[PDB]
């Protein structure tokens, strides 16, 4: 029983499926905002659409229908730089119920907006992009592109999230060769820090795990292969073996002990944009995206409403500003950003290519 447990299950499954589409390049997303915005769409869903969303969101694996939405509103209070903006746009002839709009306000503080996809889809496309550009203060001027919506579009969800924390201890700004793959290296600016930090070693996968705290009890956990068993990113084994139970154990206080570590990590910025429909359908959320089967009767009395697409943008800025074992991240790693009090994964990513 825990939305943050479901979120982690879902985040790892989403990352695995996403990694079929992008097996080596930089990958960065916020499982928590996808879970929360997809839960609001699931609030509007019924029948086998609902059943499938609940299963892919892992709500069923952690066991509580009438408590999900209020738990998301409570969690959002505990969790809440961390900026998250979202909006559900829907074709105006499939009118949202007054009551759905009221529940969106109440549980997700989000208001669905009607657009005219059926007759002026390009204009709708451009109104979605002005709202996004406006709410993200210029970082994303054109979230949706040229032909991502047309007369067949019925409903799209947009979600853009940005994170930049303040490290508990400032790094020192040291170009080092970062290894992208067995034939290619790219110079990166490295940041260095010597500090008492929790660090662990995963014996079976020959990798180090380190926690880098930010101020308010939000930490970055970084998983960095030690032996390199593939000629590509070197992440192949960590990515086929990570599981909920394994991550839990790797991050347990018995497996991660405090120690004076010298840390070298690149200065980096990631911005990745996704269209998750094909990813979510491969995970099992099929009916929500299928015009002949979707059931959004909770959102609208009109029969003709299905989910056309999910736009997700996530961005992180990692720099030196803050308030014995060696961890040298001069080759690819997985990382996650964790809300320690809730144990919610806010972001999850692969840094492979500077």
Coordinates of C-alpha atoms in Angstrom, one line a residue, residues 20 24 26 50 55 61 66 73-75 89 94 96 108 145 162 166 197 230 242 247 250 260-261 289:
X20 CA 14.0 -0.8 -26.1
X24 CA 22.1 3.7 -25.4
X26 CA 20.8 9.9 -22.9
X50 CA -9.6 1.6 -16.3
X55 CA -2.6 -2.5 -13.9
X61 CA 0.2 -4.6 -7.7
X66 CA -11.5 5.0 -4.0
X73 CA -3.4 14.9 -3.6
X74 CA -1.8 14.1 -0.2
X75 CA 1.5 13.0 -1.6
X89 CA -6.5 19.0 -23.9
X94 CA -16.4 15.4 -26.6
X96 CA -15.6 17.2 -20.4
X108 CA -4.7 17.2 -9.2
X145 CA 5.7 19.4 -33.5
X162 CA 12.3 20.7 -14.4
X166 CA 21.3 22.7 -4.4
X197 CA 28.7 10.0 1.8
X230 CA 29.8 -4.6 -22.9
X242 CA 17.5 -3.8 -12.0
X247 CA 17.1 -1.4 -6.0
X250 CA 21.0 -1.8 -3.0
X260 CA 34.9 9.4 3.0
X261 CA 34.7 9.2 -0.8
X289 CA -5.3 4.7 -26.9

